[PDB]
Amino acid sequence: KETKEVYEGEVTELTPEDAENPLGGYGKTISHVIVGLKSAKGTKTLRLDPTIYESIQREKVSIGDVIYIEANTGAVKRVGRSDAYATEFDLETEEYVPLPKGEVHKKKEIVQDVTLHDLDVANARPQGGQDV
Amino acid sequence: KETKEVYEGEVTELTPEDAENPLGGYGKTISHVIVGLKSAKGTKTLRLDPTIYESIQREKVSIGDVIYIEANTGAVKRVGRSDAYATEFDLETEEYVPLPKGEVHKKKEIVQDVTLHDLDVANARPQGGQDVISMMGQLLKPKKTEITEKLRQEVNKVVAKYIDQGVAELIPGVLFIDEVNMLDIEIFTYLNKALESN
Amino acid sequence: IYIEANTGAVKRVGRSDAYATEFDLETEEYVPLPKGEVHKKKEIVQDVTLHDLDVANARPQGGQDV
Amino acid sequence: AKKYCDVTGLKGFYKSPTNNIRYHNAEIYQLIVKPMAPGVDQEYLKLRGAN
Amino acid sequence: QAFRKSIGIKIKEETELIEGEVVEIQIDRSITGGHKQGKLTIKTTDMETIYELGNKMIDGLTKEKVLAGDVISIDKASGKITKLGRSFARSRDYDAMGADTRFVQCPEGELQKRKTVV
Amino acid sequence: QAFRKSIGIKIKEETELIEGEVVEIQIDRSITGGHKQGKLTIKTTDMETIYELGNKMIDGLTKEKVLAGDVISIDKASGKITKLGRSFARSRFVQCPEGELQKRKTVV
Amino acid sequence: EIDVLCDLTQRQAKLYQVLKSQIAVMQFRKVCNHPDLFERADVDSPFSFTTFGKTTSKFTDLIYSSRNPIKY
Amino acid sequence: VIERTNGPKNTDSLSFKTITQELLEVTRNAPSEGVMASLLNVEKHAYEREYLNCIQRGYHPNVSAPPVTIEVLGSSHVTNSINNELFDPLISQALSDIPAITQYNMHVKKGIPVEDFPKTGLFPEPLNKNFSSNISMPSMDRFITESAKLRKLDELLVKLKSEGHRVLIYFQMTKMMDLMEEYLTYRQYNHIRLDGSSKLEDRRDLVHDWQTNPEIFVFLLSTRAGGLGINLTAADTVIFYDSDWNPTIDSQAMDRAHRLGQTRQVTVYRLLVRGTIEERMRDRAKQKEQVQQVV
Amino acid sequence: LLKKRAGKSRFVKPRRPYNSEGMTRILRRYEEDLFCTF
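^ Those are the sequences you sent over. The predicted structure of the assembly is below.
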């Protein structure tokens, strides 16, 4: 049994805020990232760590997509484009998830069932790495 | 009795020069790397190809380390941090090495003791070069293979050439097979052939 | 050079012998001109078996280079 | 430009380092290029305008 | 292999234990994130030192994320990062984190100690 | 495999080899390194010549470091340089080559 | 006075019995002091089965040139 | 493998997410003190429990050889093909990394974005720093432990330094004092070397710096270089490595140290090895002692 | 000359150099975090 705390919804705004005193030789020093989330019957504006920005750029998240933010680690991911953004464009063939229900903040208690052989073959098979 | 060509010393500078067309598909990103080495009563400046620098950066060489470049194979050993700087401000259990004596460029004699099977195995599965084939040979799982007679003949030719120059010297030995009744008729019939070789 | 029109294969025979005296010592090999025409055409017959196509479509590591 | 032997007029493979005379092979060198009198290489080089 | 599994080798090792309060972390990485280096400023109630970091130390600091005011303990030979708790109790907190880190005290005495492990 | 290891094919071919004793190496480097000029003086017991090198011959002579007094063999087409040893200068030890510098070698 | 006594190592006793078998007092006492007095330990490296570009003697060029001695 | 791209796939397909990769992708960025994170992190915990990042390498190969050269006489195409196969830029770039300043040059000063960089950093990470190469350099420890006299010398020096003391050591050969400061710099001990091979000017201020500075720990010496008239009252512990030559020389040796002005007890340590010519040397020295004491 | 002959004849170690050119900076104080990217 486990408790998962998550943030999700359509992206309304995404602005990396500039710092008060930038450092020389660098472009765009960031002090925090303002992300606005919107879902069914809910809208909340978040303040994030500055180091979420390269994970945002890695996932190529734009305005109007649906994201999935873990609480403790950040670690955003693009679930897909919002289904309200299908009709403005004639040929846009990304997937179109519906707008998620409930609030953007939720504590769901999940229960996962595994066998000992699954743990054995997960630990023996080496984890997702970058070596050839 | 073999001889080695050795460049060694403390790294003082590490500057690469880029290529004009990095995305041209053919050729590396860099063209040369300038490396400045300082030893006791000596200082040399070296200009390397990307091939040697790839092994150097595989050894994770920084400024302030003492290295050891062997020119016979291109192998690079990072000895450790130099003791000319501060010691107690590290977090990665390094060792602290004095400056190497003598000149940077050296020639030293090493007496080695090897067998014929070592040469056969090292030639059948090549490792220790800087090319792609010998580099990927260190990563795959090793496995025994049927060594051909041609490779043994070529190794015999090279060893006889080494003996003819007065460098090598052959030392025959003893093979002791205990509990010889466990063998079957095929190994005995091959042993009849193998005892008659020269 | 050598260019096949249907396949697209490119093979470099070597430098021409008209440039043989640009240096006294060189790494490049020098070959004479073709006495033939530039354009050559020929009709050939190919013989393959079904096992050849079977082993050509069932390579497990992948399609190797020429 | 093509390089030719200065003595024989054949194809010049080698050039002498003392008097810059291109010769064909060994016996031409040993019989002409080495023992030549000093003042004869200049009008050997004058035919191609190299003096 | 069955014979050699039944003979153990007991090895003596020398390690250094570093426990203190984190003041400032600076991490410098390249554009592709391959080369990593930086400086760590840790302190106790008496002393304060600026260290140097390598690749695996930075990788251990990125996981179990330390936020400049956490109390950590580092084993030099094992290379293990353990976050004991939070002591500074900073006021400005953004909603990108959901942990409930404990209130521990700032350690005193010597910053670096010498230990022997077996 | 054992049956087909005992049938041979005999092929004769021809090649051009340059083998002699190196007299002197002159290599000049520009500050930018855009071009490399050079001159190579090589000799046998019967001849003496001086060559002008291109860029890649200069690069192939810098690699496999050749000094004065060495006895080397150069393949023009493949660009392979083999150090046969050192000539008789006491300051391994191989006699100086004779005859022509450029020779035809038939290998069977 | 504290007269400290200790036993020889296997290397020290090994060269001790070696030069006892080959056979002057300073030869005994210098291997009683250190085995590094007679020979010095060197770099432990694999034997290089290569034919590379070696020298026989404002910078220097260093190009990778290792090749196998066996030629096909 | 090299240019594998993790492109997105449409959900309307026969492919599923089985429980193996449903467990695999969760613990990619998971922190510690989690349940499912720690249940899949057995290997790293076993790595750091057994102190495997400070272990020594035991095996190195005997022969290392490059691949067998194939030569074709008189064809540059063979050389080009062999050089392309042995040093292919894509795989060689994959097993290497670009320098950081070079990356800054092609990204900022040339405008090339990140996603069309050549792929780098795919070489596997070794277990230690010790396992990264086949070359092992001569080791101070093995240098210390192969000599029994130096082995016993390294023991009492630790507690002598822990006491906060001053040590004098006497020697006989060049290499008796040409190898010992390597051990001292291994222990980073404050030391100086005095012998008459050095100039006469240096003996004036070396004794002055010894008697004035208290942080100096080790004072090397030959037999007669500083054991004659030199005031060494700031130390007590004289250590004789091989002083067995004659009792007359050693009787002046501690005379330079055990002198007027010493404020503490003097502990003299004489080092010897049993079962060798040192026994006969000390026996002849004792015979000289008993001859000269009566007479 | 006699007077000159009589009158004339009778440490902490610096840190290693740290450099980071063309490398992004992640910086973390007590009260604010920074990310100096490129």
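Chains C and A do not touch (no CB pair under 8 Å). The first strand of chain C starts at residue 2 and ends at 3.

Shout if you want it in another format.
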